[PDB]
Amino acid sequence: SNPHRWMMTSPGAPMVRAEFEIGELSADQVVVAVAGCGVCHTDLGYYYDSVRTNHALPLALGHEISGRVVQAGANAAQWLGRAVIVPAVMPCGTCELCTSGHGTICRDQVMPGNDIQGGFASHVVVPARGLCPVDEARLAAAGLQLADVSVVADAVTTPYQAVLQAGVEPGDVAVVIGVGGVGGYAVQIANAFGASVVAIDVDPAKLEMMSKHGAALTLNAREISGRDLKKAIEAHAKANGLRLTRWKIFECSGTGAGQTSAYGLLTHGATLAVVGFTMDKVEVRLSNLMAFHARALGNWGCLPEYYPAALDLVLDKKIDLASFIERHPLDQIGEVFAAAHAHKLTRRAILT
Amino acid sequence: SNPHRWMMTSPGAPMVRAEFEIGELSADQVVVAVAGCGVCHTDLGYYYDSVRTNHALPLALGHEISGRVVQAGANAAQWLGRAVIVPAVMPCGTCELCTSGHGTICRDQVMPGNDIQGGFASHVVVPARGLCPVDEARLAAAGLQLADVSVVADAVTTPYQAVLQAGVEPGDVAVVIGVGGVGGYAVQIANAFGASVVAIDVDPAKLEMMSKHGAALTLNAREISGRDLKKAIEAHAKANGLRLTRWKIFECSGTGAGQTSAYGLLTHGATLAVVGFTMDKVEVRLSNLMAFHARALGNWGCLPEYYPAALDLVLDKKIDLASFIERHPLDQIGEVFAAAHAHKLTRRAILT
Ligand SMILES: NC(=O)c1ccc[n+]([C@@H]2O[C@H](COP(=O)([O-])OP(=O)(O)OC[C@H]3O[C@@H](n4cnc5c(N)ncnc54)[C@H](O)[C@@H]3O)[C@@H](O)[C@H]2O)c1
Ligand SMILES: NC(=O)c1ccc[n+]([C@@H]2O[C@H](COP(=O)([O-])OP(=O)(O)OC[C@H]3O[C@@H](n4cnc5c(N)ncnc54)[C@H](O)[C@@H]3O)[C@@H](O)[C@H]2O)c1
Ligand SMILES: [Zn+2]
Ligand SMILES: [Zn+2]
Ligand SMILES: [Zn+2]
Ligand SMILES: [Zn+2]
C-alpha cells in the first residue's frame, strides 16, 4: 500500500527496495502506476559498465514504461485514469528547437531512469507532455496486457523514427544490420511499410526468428563477406523484381563492423539510417554519398508525436510484440539484469 | 560559314577543328548557337587525366553552355530565337526515378561533352527538354553578356542543389570547406539564402576574394587546426547571435583532408553536404550522426528544373559571376586548357 522503487545505489551493488511518498505535483506532472517497464542495454550500460546517469545516485532505472495516470498536477487532470505509454525521452515541447521540428535535440529533454527516477517502481512521476494514450479495447482485441506495450517506448519507437525518416515505400529493398532489440523491430516496421527486408546478424537464432517476422532474406555476417553481400542483395532484388536503387539500410548493431558493412551497401539514391552507437571510428569513401546521390541519416530516439502510430502497428497486428516480450515480477530485477548481462534471455524482459 | 567543333581525338593530343553538317532534327531537338562554354575540372579530367567519356572519341568536350536556339525539330518551334542555358546533365523526365524526384540518378541522363558532342563548338544539338530560358532585358540590366551565364550550368547549379537540399535558412551558420570553383558559389548561395558563411581554404587569395562575396569569416586550414577550428566557429556564432545547432557544412574541396575537417564540424541537427569527390577513404565516428541527430547529404549535379532559380540569383545580383569569369576566343581552346592545368588561371574560362 506504499509506492516503492528499486534503485541503483552504485554500479554492480544490489538494487535497494525504497518506499517513498509522492509530494505536491507541479502543473504539468502526473504519477503513472507502472503496469510494466522494459529492460534495455542502456539500463545494463548504467549498471554493469558504469555509464554516468544525469541524476545522481541512488536512481531507479527504466525508461520503457507503460501504466495508468492515477494522479495529476493542475494542468494535467485530463490524463486521470487514461492508460499511457511514457516516452523514453520527452522534449520541452515549448522551446524554438521543439517548436521548429527539432525536438530530438531539445536542450531540456527528460529521460525517466536517467534524468529523473525511472519505471522499475510501482509508481513514477513524469511530465504529461507527449504521453501516448492506449486504447484498452483495441489492446485487449490484439490479445495484449497494458504491461506488454511498455517496450513500444525506445525499442519500437526508435527504429520507427529511423524508418519514417528513411521514407521506406513499397518495392524497396531494406537491409537491417544487427537484428536484435531495436534491429528486430526495424525489420518488422520496414516490412510493414512495404519493403522486402534482408536481415543481417552474427547470431543464426535471431536470423531464424526474423524469418517468421518480416525478413524475406537472412545472411550471417560471419559467413558472407562485403563483396559477396552486395552480390547476394542485388540477386535478391533482381530475382523478386525489387528496386536496384533507393535501398533503405538500417545500421542497428552499434559496432564498427556493422557500420562498415552497411556503408558498403550504399547504391544510387540509398538512405543509410545510423541508429546504433559506437565510439569506434570507421574507414569509408565519404564521397560515395555524392557519387550515388545518397544520404546517411542519424536518429536520436523518437519524437513523442510518432508514439501513437508505432502503437497502432502493434494494435493492428502489422507487427508482433508477444513473441519478443516476457513479463517478470519487478522483485526479480536482480536475477533479470544478471540473466540479460549473461545473454541468457531471448525475449525482452518487462518488470511488473 | 560551316558549323565546327574542337574535338578531343586522344588524351593529351592536339584539339582538332572539325566542321560538320546539322541534319534533319528529331521532334524534340534544337541547335543552340553557342555564346559561351565554360572550362571545368571535369573537362581537364577527360583530357589530361585520361578519364573515359561515354561517347567514343573523337569528342567535343564542354557541358557549361549558353547560347541561342537557331533551329528546332517539329515539336520545339517555340524555342527559336530564345537565349538559353543548356543543363550540364539532362534526365529522361519519363522514368520512375525522374518521375519520383530522383532525376539526378536517372540511368538515361545525357551530358553534353561526355554522352553527346559538347559546347566547345559554334553549334551543339541538344534536347529542348530542360532548356533554361534567359531574360536578355534582365541579363543586360545585370551588366552581363549571354556568354557569361554559360557557367551557371554545373558551377552555380551544383552548389545550388547542395544548398537547397541542406535547407539553409536565416539564423544558420554555414561552413564551406574548399572555396574554389563550386565552393565559391556555395559561399555566395548559402549567404543569399540567409546564412552567416564561414569560408575555409588553403589558398589565402580565394579567402581574401570570398570576404568581398558573402564570407562573413575566413579561416586558413593550414594555420588553424581541427580542435581550434570548432572553437573559432562556435566563437563566430556566439558573438553574432547565430544558431549553435543545425550548422550547414558544405565539403567542396574533393580532398580527404577537407572531408575529415567538415565531418569534425558536425553538431546537434547539422547537415553535412558532400559535394566534392575523392577516391581517398577517411576515418570518422559514423555514430556522431545518431548522437547529434545529424545527416550527410550527397549531391550529383542538379535537376534542370532548378536552373531558372540559380540564374535568377545572378540576374538579381544576389550573387556575382563577373568577378569569377573570363571570356576567351574558342580558337584558344589549346592555350586555355594548358593554362588551367598549370593552375595559371584565377577566373573560370569561358570559350566563345
Ligand atoms: N538511436 C537511438 O536513439 C538508440 C536507442 C536505443 C538503441 N540504440 C543503440 O542501438 C545499438 C543496439 O541496440 P539494441 O539494444 O537493439 O542491441 P542488441 O545487443 O539487442 O542488438 C545488437 C545486435 O547486433 C548484432 N551484431 C553485432 N555485431 C554485428 C555485426 N558485425 N554485424 C551484424 N550484426 C551484428 C548482435 O548479434 C545483436 O543481435 C546500441 O549501439 C544502442 O546504444 C540507439
Ligand atoms: N557534386 C557534383 O555534382 C560535382 C560537380 C562539380 C564538381 N564536383 C567536385 O567538386 C570538387 C571541387 O571542384 P572545384 O572545381 O570547385 O575545384 P577547385 O580546385 O576549383 O576547388 C577546390 C578547393 O579546395 C581547396 N582545398 C584543397 N584542399 C583543402 C583542404 N584540405 N581544406 C580546405 N580547402 C582545401 C583548394 O584550395 C580549392 O580552393 C571536386 O572533387 C569535383 O570533382 C562535383
Ligand atoms: Zn531502452
Ligand atoms: Zn524543447
Ligand atoms: Zn562543369
Ligand atoms: Zn530517366
mmCIF file of C-alpha atoms in Angstrom, chain B residues 13-315:
data_model
loop_
_atom_site.group_PDB
_atom_site.id
_atom_site.type_symbol
_atom_site.label_atom_id
_atom_site.label_comp_id
_atom_site.label_asym_id
_atom_site.label_seq_id
_atom_site.Cartn_x
_atom_site.Cartn_y
_atom_site.Cartn_z
ATOM 1 C CA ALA B 13 46.862 15.059 -78.341
ATOM 2 C CA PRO B 14 46.028 18.406 -80.036
ATOM 3 C CA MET B 15 42.359 19.514 -80.291
ATOM 4 C CA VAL B 16 41.133 19.215 -83.944
ATOM 5 C CA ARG B 17 38.902 21.774 -85.709
ATOM 6 C CA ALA B 18 36.226 19.626 -87.445
ATOM 7 C CA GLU B 19 33.388 21.217 -89.490
ATOM 8 C CA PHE B 20 30.095 19.210 -89.640
ATOM 9 C CA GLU B 21 26.553 19.199 -91.105
ATOM 10 C CA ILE B 22 23.412 19.514 -88.909
ATOM 11 C CA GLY B 23 20.913 17.063 -90.462
ATOM 12 C CA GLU B 24 17.103 16.768 -90.163
ATOM 13 C CA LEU B 25 16.207 17.265 -86.424
ATOM 14 C CA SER B 26 14.017 14.800 -84.415
ATOM 15 C CA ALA B 27 10.817 16.371 -82.965
ATOM 16 C CA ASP B 28 12.253 17.395 -79.504
ATOM 17 C CA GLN B 29 15.757 18.500 -80.699
ATOM 18 C CA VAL B 30 17.184 22.029 -81.138
ATOM 19 C CA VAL B 31 20.510 23.501 -82.340
ATOM 20 C CA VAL B 32 21.904 26.157 -79.977
ATOM 21 C CA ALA B 33 24.435 28.618 -81.441
ATOM 22 C CA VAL B 34 26.963 28.664 -78.534
ATOM 23 C CA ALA B 35 27.526 32.158 -76.994
ATOM 24 C CA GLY B 36 29.990 30.668 -74.471
ATOM 25 C CA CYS B 37 31.029 27.335 -72.905
ATOM 26 C CA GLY B 38 32.782 27.017 -69.512
ATOM 27 C CA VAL B 39 36.045 25.047 -68.969
ATOM 28 C CA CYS B 40 35.661 22.728 -65.962
ATOM 29 C CA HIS B 41 37.955 20.356 -63.981
ATOM 30 C CA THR B 42 35.690 17.588 -65.433
ATOM 31 C CA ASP B 43 36.853 18.676 -68.967
ATOM 32 C CA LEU B 44 40.547 18.821 -67.813
ATOM 33 C CA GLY B 45 39.898 15.353 -66.281
ATOM 34 C CA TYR B 46 38.829 13.792 -69.630
ATOM 35 C CA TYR B 47 41.780 15.442 -71.477
ATOM 36 C CA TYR B 48 44.789 15.452 -69.045
ATOM 37 C CA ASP B 49 43.941 12.506 -66.639
ATOM 38 C CA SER B 50 42.501 10.102 -69.338
ATOM 39 C CA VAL B 51 39.009 9.737 -67.691
ATOM 40 C CA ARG B 52 36.751 7.645 -70.039
ATOM 41 C CA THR B 53 33.951 9.586 -71.858
ATOM 42 C CA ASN B 54 30.660 7.644 -72.511
ATOM 43 C CA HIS B 55 30.746 8.686 -76.230
ATOM 44 C CA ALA B 56 33.756 7.243 -78.146
ATOM 45 C CA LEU B 57 36.464 9.673 -79.426
ATOM 46 C CA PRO B 58 36.761 11.963 -81.208
ATOM 47 C CA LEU B 59 34.511 14.174 -78.948
ATOM 48 C CA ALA B 60 33.995 17.938 -78.433
ATOM 49 C CA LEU B 61 34.032 18.475 -74.612
ATOM 50 C CA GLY B 62 32.136 21.306 -72.801
ATOM 51 C CA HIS B 63 28.915 20.953 -70.715
ATOM 52 C CA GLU B 64 28.726 24.553 -69.333
ATOM 53 C CA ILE B 65 26.817 26.037 -72.363
ATOM 54 C CA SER B 66 24.814 29.221 -73.026
ATOM 55 C CA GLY B 67 23.640 30.324 -76.497
ATOM 56 C CA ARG B 68 20.617 30.831 -78.776
ATOM 57 C CA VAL B 69 18.195 28.287 -80.331
ATOM 58 C CA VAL B 70 18.684 28.873 -84.138
ATOM 59 C CA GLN B 71 16.972 25.616 -85.321
ATOM 60 C CA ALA B 72 14.210 23.343 -83.881
ATOM 61 C CA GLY B 73 12.561 19.956 -84.576
ATOM 62 C CA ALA B 74 8.781 19.936 -85.300
ATOM 63 C CA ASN B 75 7.621 19.932 -81.581
ATOM 64 C CA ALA B 76 10.147 22.655 -80.433
ATOM 65 C CA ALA B 77 9.348 25.710 -82.707
ATOM 66 C CA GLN B 78 8.502 27.851 -79.586
ATOM 67 C CA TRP B 79 12.297 27.772 -78.710
ATOM 68 C CA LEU B 80 13.532 29.519 -81.957
ATOM 69 C CA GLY B 81 15.420 32.762 -81.117
ATOM 70 C CA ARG B 82 15.173 32.207 -77.306
ATOM 71 C CA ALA B 83 18.513 32.686 -75.424
ATOM 72 C CA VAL B 84 19.105 29.547 -73.269
ATOM 73 C CA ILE B 85 21.363 27.849 -70.728
ATOM 74 C CA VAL B 86 21.763 24.115 -71.556
ATOM 75 C CA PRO B 87 21.585 21.831 -68.485
ATOM 76 C CA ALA B 88 25.018 20.173 -67.946
ATOM 77 C CA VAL B 89 23.076 16.855 -67.429
ATOM 78 C CA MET B 90 19.523 16.112 -68.812
ATOM 79 C CA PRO B 91 17.441 13.295 -67.229
ATOM 80 C CA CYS B 92 14.743 11.343 -69.268
ATOM 81 C CA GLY B 93 11.880 13.057 -67.497
ATOM 82 C CA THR B 94 9.799 9.843 -68.122
ATOM 83 C CA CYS B 95 11.331 7.088 -65.889
ATOM 84 C CA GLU B 96 10.171 6.082 -62.347
ATOM 85 C CA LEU B 97 13.393 7.740 -60.963
ATOM 86 C CA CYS B 98 12.872 11.048 -62.939
ATOM 87 C CA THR B 99 9.056 10.987 -62.062
ATOM 88 C CA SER B 100 9.614 10.279 -58.281
ATOM 89 C CA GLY B 101 12.003 13.307 -57.942
ATOM 90 C CA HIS B 102 15.255 11.212 -58.370
ATOM 91 C CA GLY B 103 16.255 12.774 -61.781
ATOM 92 C CA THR B 104 19.925 13.101 -60.576
ATOM 93 C CA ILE B 105 20.174 9.239 -60.802
ATOM 94 C CA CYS B 106 18.286 8.686 -63.939
ATOM 95 C CA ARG B 107 20.079 5.993 -65.766
ATOM 96 C CA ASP B 108 19.300 7.580 -69.201
ATOM 97 C CA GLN B 109 20.699 11.083 -68.384
ATOM 98 C CA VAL B 110 22.662 12.799 -71.230
ATOM 99 C CA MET B 111 25.580 15.210 -70.590
ATOM 100 C CA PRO B 112 26.914 17.327 -73.496
ATOM 101 C CA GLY B 113 30.708 16.828 -73.913
ATOM 102 C CA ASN B 114 30.519 13.273 -72.488
ATOM 103 C CA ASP B 115 27.396 11.383 -73.775
ATOM 104 C CA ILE B 116 26.933 13.666 -76.856
ATOM 105 C CA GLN B 117 29.079 16.228 -78.783
ATOM 106 C CA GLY B 118 29.735 19.220 -76.440
ATOM 107 C CA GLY B 119 29.783 23.026 -76.468
ATOM 108 C CA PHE B 120 33.418 23.769 -77.499
ATOM 109 C CA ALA B 121 31.755 24.471 -80.880
ATOM 110 C CA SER B 122 29.894 27.174 -82.896
ATOM 111 C CA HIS B 123 26.794 24.930 -82.587
ATOM 112 C CA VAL B 124 25.595 21.973 -80.434
ATOM 113 C CA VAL B 125 22.487 19.703 -80.923
ATOM 114 C CA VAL B 126 20.620 19.034 -77.625
ATOM 115 C CA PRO B 127 17.105 18.086 -76.449
ATOM 116 C CA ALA B 128 14.685 21.054 -75.862
ATOM 117 C CA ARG B 129 13.539 19.418 -72.557
ATOM 118 C CA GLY B 130 15.072 21.264 -69.561
ATOM 119 C CA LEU B 131 16.399 24.273 -71.538
ATOM 120 C CA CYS B 132 16.591 27.302 -69.181
ATOM 121 C CA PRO B 133 15.151 30.498 -70.765
ATOM 122 C CA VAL B 134 17.369 33.657 -70.311
ATOM 123 C CA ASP B 135 15.636 37.101 -69.993
ATOM 124 C CA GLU B 136 18.009 39.288 -72.145
ATOM 125 C CA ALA B 137 16.486 42.568 -70.755
ATOM 126 C CA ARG B 138 17.403 41.392 -67.183
ATOM 127 C CA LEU B 139 20.752 39.953 -68.485
ATOM 128 C CA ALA B 140 21.701 43.452 -69.812
ATOM 129 C CA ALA B 141 20.493 45.187 -66.577
ATOM 130 C CA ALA B 142 22.878 42.875 -64.549
ATOM 131 C CA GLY B 143 25.706 44.088 -66.902
ATOM 132 C CA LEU B 144 26.236 40.615 -68.472
ATOM 133 C CA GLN B 145 26.629 39.045 -71.956
ATOM 134 C CA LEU B 146 24.795 35.754 -72.794
ATOM 135 C CA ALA B 147 28.244 34.009 -72.859
ATOM 136 C CA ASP B 148 28.850 34.929 -69.140
ATOM 137 C CA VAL B 149 25.893 32.809 -67.761
ATOM 138 C CA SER B 150 27.302 29.667 -69.532
ATOM 139 C CA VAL B 151 28.979 28.745 -66.150
ATOM 140 C CA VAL B 152 25.516 28.843 -64.378
ATOM 141 C CA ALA B 153 25.442 25.208 -65.663
ATOM 142 C CA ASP B 154 27.349 22.890 -63.218
ATOM 143 C CA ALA B 155 29.491 25.635 -61.489
ATOM 144 C CA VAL B 156 26.445 27.502 -59.983
ATOM 145 C CA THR B 157 23.701 24.782 -60.216
ATOM 146 C CA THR B 158 25.804 22.047 -58.472
ATOM 147 C CA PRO B 159 26.303 24.034 -55.222
ATOM 148 C CA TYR B 160 22.721 25.421 -55.692
ATOM 149 C CA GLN B 161 21.331 21.838 -55.440
ATOM 150 C CA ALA B 162 23.583 21.187 -52.382
ATOM 151 C CA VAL B 163 22.257 24.351 -50.582
ATOM 152 C CA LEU B 164 18.553 23.764 -51.482
ATOM 153 C CA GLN B 165 18.836 20.101 -50.205
ATOM 154 C CA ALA B 166 20.577 21.299 -46.972
ATOM 155 C CA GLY B 167 17.629 23.653 -46.186
ATOM 156 C CA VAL B 168 19.788 26.710 -45.343
ATOM 157 C CA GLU B 169 17.566 29.351 -43.635
ATOM 158 C CA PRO B 170 18.126 32.695 -41.820
ATOM 159 C CA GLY B 171 19.949 32.332 -38.463
ATOM 160 C CA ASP B 172 22.100 29.453 -39.830
ATOM 161 C CA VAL B 173 25.872 29.220 -39.612
ATOM 162 C CA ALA B 174 27.073 27.789 -42.977
ATOM 163 C CA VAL B 175 30.642 26.437 -43.359
ATOM 164 C CA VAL B 176 32.051 25.795 -46.891
ATOM 165 C CA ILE B 177 35.395 23.886 -46.988
ATOM 166 C CA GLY B 178 37.317 24.469 -50.238
ATOM 167 C CA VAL B 179 36.059 27.743 -51.650
ATOM 168 C CA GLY B 180 37.252 27.475 -55.273
ATOM 169 C CA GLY B 181 35.059 26.765 -58.337
ATOM 170 C CA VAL B 182 31.942 25.065 -56.881
ATOM 171 C CA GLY B 183 32.844 26.146 -53.275
ATOM 172 C CA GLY B 184 32.925 29.895 -54.082
ATOM 173 C CA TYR B 185 29.315 29.775 -55.413
ATOM 174 C CA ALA B 186 28.447 27.560 -52.371
ATOM 175 C CA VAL B 187 29.526 30.556 -50.156
ATOM 176 C CA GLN B 188 27.627 33.092 -52.355
ATOM 177 C CA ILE B 189 24.373 30.997 -52.438
ATOM 178 C CA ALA B 190 24.409 29.973 -48.709
ATOM 179 C CA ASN B 191 24.774 33.726 -47.976
ATOM 180 C CA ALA B 192 21.904 34.640 -50.394
ATOM 181 C CA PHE B 193 19.728 32.036 -48.512
ATOM 182 C CA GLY B 194 20.412 33.960 -45.222
ATOM 183 C CA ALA B 195 23.330 32.067 -43.537
ATOM 184 C CA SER B 196 26.418 33.700 -41.978
ATOM 185 C CA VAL B 197 29.064 31.866 -44.069
ATOM 186 C CA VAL B 198 32.467 30.740 -42.709
ATOM 187 C CA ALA B 199 34.850 30.104 -45.704
ATOM 188 C CA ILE B 200 37.748 27.590 -45.187
ATOM 189 C CA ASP B 201 40.644 27.035 -47.683
ATOM 190 C CA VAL B 202 44.467 26.521 -48.001
ATOM 191 C CA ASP B 203 44.814 29.465 -50.523
ATOM 192 C CA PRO B 204 44.615 32.901 -48.776
ATOM 193 C CA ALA B 205 43.845 34.627 -52.170
ATOM 194 C CA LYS B 206 40.487 32.784 -52.556
ATOM 195 C CA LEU B 207 39.779 33.529 -48.831
ATOM 196 C CA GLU B 208 40.567 37.287 -49.406
ATOM 197 C CA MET B 209 38.312 37.116 -52.559
ATOM 198 C CA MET B 210 35.296 35.495 -50.745
ATOM 199 C CA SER B 211 35.477 38.157 -47.898
ATOM 200 C CA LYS B 212 34.031 40.552 -50.564
ATOM 201 C CA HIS B 213 31.404 37.979 -51.832
ATOM 202 C CA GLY B 214 29.483 36.567 -48.775
ATOM 203 C CA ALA B 215 32.129 35.034 -46.432
ATOM 204 C CA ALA B 216 31.496 36.831 -43.060
ATOM 205 C CA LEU B 217 34.503 34.878 -41.587
ATOM 206 C CA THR B 218 37.547 33.201 -43.302
ATOM 207 C CA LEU B 219 39.985 30.574 -41.866
ATOM 208 C CA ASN B 220 43.180 29.148 -43.461
ATOM 209 C CA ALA B 221 43.104 25.338 -42.889
ATOM 210 C CA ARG B 222 46.993 25.270 -42.858
ATOM 211 C CA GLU B 223 47.075 27.811 -39.921
ATOM 212 C CA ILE B 224 44.002 26.747 -37.773
ATOM 213 C CA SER B 225 43.771 23.011 -36.714
ATOM 214 C CA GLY B 226 40.608 20.867 -36.027
ATOM 215 C CA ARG B 227 40.105 21.494 -32.232
ATOM 216 C CA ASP B 228 40.650 25.313 -32.667
ATOM 217 C CA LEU B 229 38.519 25.394 -35.911
ATOM 218 C CA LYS B 230 35.362 24.274 -33.982
ATOM 219 C CA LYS B 231 36.078 26.794 -31.119
ATOM 220 C CA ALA B 232 36.553 29.638 -33.717
ATOM 221 C CA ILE B 233 33.158 28.909 -35.467
ATOM 222 C CA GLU B 234 31.450 28.486 -32.005
ATOM 223 C CA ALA B 235 33.038 31.936 -31.228
ATOM 224 C CA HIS B 236 31.689 33.436 -34.525
ATOM 225 C CA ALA B 237 28.170 32.035 -33.723
ATOM 226 C CA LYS B 238 28.118 33.249 -30.040
ATOM 227 C CA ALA B 239 29.483 36.744 -30.984
ATOM 228 C CA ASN B 240 26.812 37.208 -33.778
ATOM 229 C CA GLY B 241 23.760 35.592 -32.041
ATOM 230 C CA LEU B 242 23.757 32.703 -34.563
ATOM 231 C CA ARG B 243 22.497 29.095 -34.149
ATOM 232 C CA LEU B 244 24.830 26.756 -32.214
ATOM 233 C CA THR B 245 22.779 23.987 -33.866
ATOM 234 C CA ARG B 246 21.691 22.936 -37.413
ATOM 235 C CA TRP B 247 25.032 24.098 -38.994
ATOM 236 C CA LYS B 248 25.000 23.684 -42.842
ATOM 237 C CA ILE B 249 28.552 22.364 -43.666
ATOM 238 C CA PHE B 250 29.425 22.058 -47.446
ATOM 239 C CA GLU B 251 32.559 19.955 -48.268
ATOM 240 C CA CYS B 252 33.601 21.420 -51.695
ATOM 241 C CA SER B 253 37.387 20.585 -51.654
ATOM 242 C CA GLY B 254 37.177 16.989 -53.026
ATOM 243 C CA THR B 255 40.071 16.018 -50.682
ATOM 244 C CA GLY B 256 40.150 13.644 -47.650
ATOM 245 C CA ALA B 257 41.567 16.495 -45.503
ATOM 246 C CA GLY B 258 38.516 18.691 -46.328
ATOM 247 C CA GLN B 259 36.099 15.771 -45.653
ATOM 248 C CA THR B 260 37.757 14.928 -42.271
ATOM 249 C CA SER B 261 37.653 18.666 -41.326
ATOM 250 C CA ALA B 262 33.941 19.097 -42.363
ATOM 251 C CA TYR B 263 32.813 15.868 -40.572
ATOM 252 C CA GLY B 264 34.597 17.168 -37.404
ATOM 253 C CA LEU B 265 32.360 20.302 -37.524
ATOM 254 C CA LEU B 266 29.097 18.254 -37.112
ATOM 255 C CA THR B 267 26.851 19.427 -34.234
ATOM 256 C CA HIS B 268 23.246 18.845 -32.998
ATOM 257 C CA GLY B 269 20.915 18.914 -36.073
ATOM 258 C CA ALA B 270 23.809 19.647 -38.529
ATOM 259 C CA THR B 271 23.637 18.818 -42.301
ATOM 260 C CA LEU B 272 26.949 17.747 -43.961
ATOM 261 C CA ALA B 273 26.567 18.342 -47.759
ATOM 262 C CA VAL B 274 29.119 16.038 -49.583
ATOM 263 C CA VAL B 275 29.730 17.862 -52.944
ATOM 264 C CA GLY B 276 33.463 17.162 -53.580
ATOM 265 C CA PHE B 277 34.585 13.731 -54.913
ATOM 266 C CA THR B 278 37.811 11.940 -53.809
ATOM 267 C CA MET B 279 38.725 8.207 -54.057
ATOM 268 C CA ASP B 280 40.522 8.647 -50.645
ATOM 269 C CA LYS B 281 38.919 6.776 -47.687
ATOM 270 C CA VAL B 282 38.595 8.793 -44.356
ATOM 271 C CA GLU B 283 38.345 7.649 -40.665
ATOM 272 C CA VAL B 284 35.146 9.095 -38.980
ATOM 273 C CA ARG B 285 32.922 8.374 -35.917
ATOM 274 C CA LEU B 286 29.839 7.478 -38.064
ATOM 275 C CA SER B 287 27.677 7.279 -34.863
ATOM 276 C CA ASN B 288 28.137 11.080 -34.355
ATOM 277 C CA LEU B 289 25.269 11.213 -36.967
ATOM 278 C CA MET B 290 22.973 9.435 -34.423
ATOM 279 C CA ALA B 291 24.428 11.328 -31.366
ATOM 280 C CA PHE B 292 23.789 14.774 -32.968
ATOM 281 C CA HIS B 293 20.636 13.641 -34.934
ATOM 282 C CA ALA B 294 22.658 14.966 -37.943
ATOM 283 C CA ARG B 295 22.620 13.957 -41.645
ATOM 284 C CA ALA B 296 25.185 13.638 -44.505
ATOM 285 C CA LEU B 297 23.675 14.506 -47.971
ATOM 286 C CA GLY B 298 25.434 13.586 -51.217
ATOM 287 C CA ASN B 299 24.660 15.669 -54.326
ATOM 288 C CA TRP B 300 25.157 14.507 -58.001
ATOM 289 C CA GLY B 301 24.851 17.731 -60.103
ATOM 290 C CA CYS B 302 21.415 19.430 -60.282
ATOM 291 C CA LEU B 303 17.871 18.866 -61.634
ATOM 292 C CA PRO B 304 17.341 21.167 -64.656
ATOM 293 C CA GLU B 305 14.087 22.406 -63.038
ATOM 294 C CA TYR B 306 16.280 24.486 -60.580
ATOM 295 C CA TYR B 307 18.336 26.271 -63.359
ATOM 296 C CA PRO B 308 15.890 29.268 -63.555
ATOM 297 C CA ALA B 309 16.252 29.938 -59.758
ATOM 298 C CA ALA B 310 20.102 29.704 -59.975
ATOM 299 C CA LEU B 311 20.032 32.153 -62.956
ATOM 300 C CA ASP B 312 17.614 34.495 -61.026
ATOM 301 C CA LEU B 313 20.323 34.744 -58.277
ATOM 302 C CA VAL B 314 22.746 36.080 -60.999
ATOM 303 C CA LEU B 315 20.216 38.349 -62.835
#
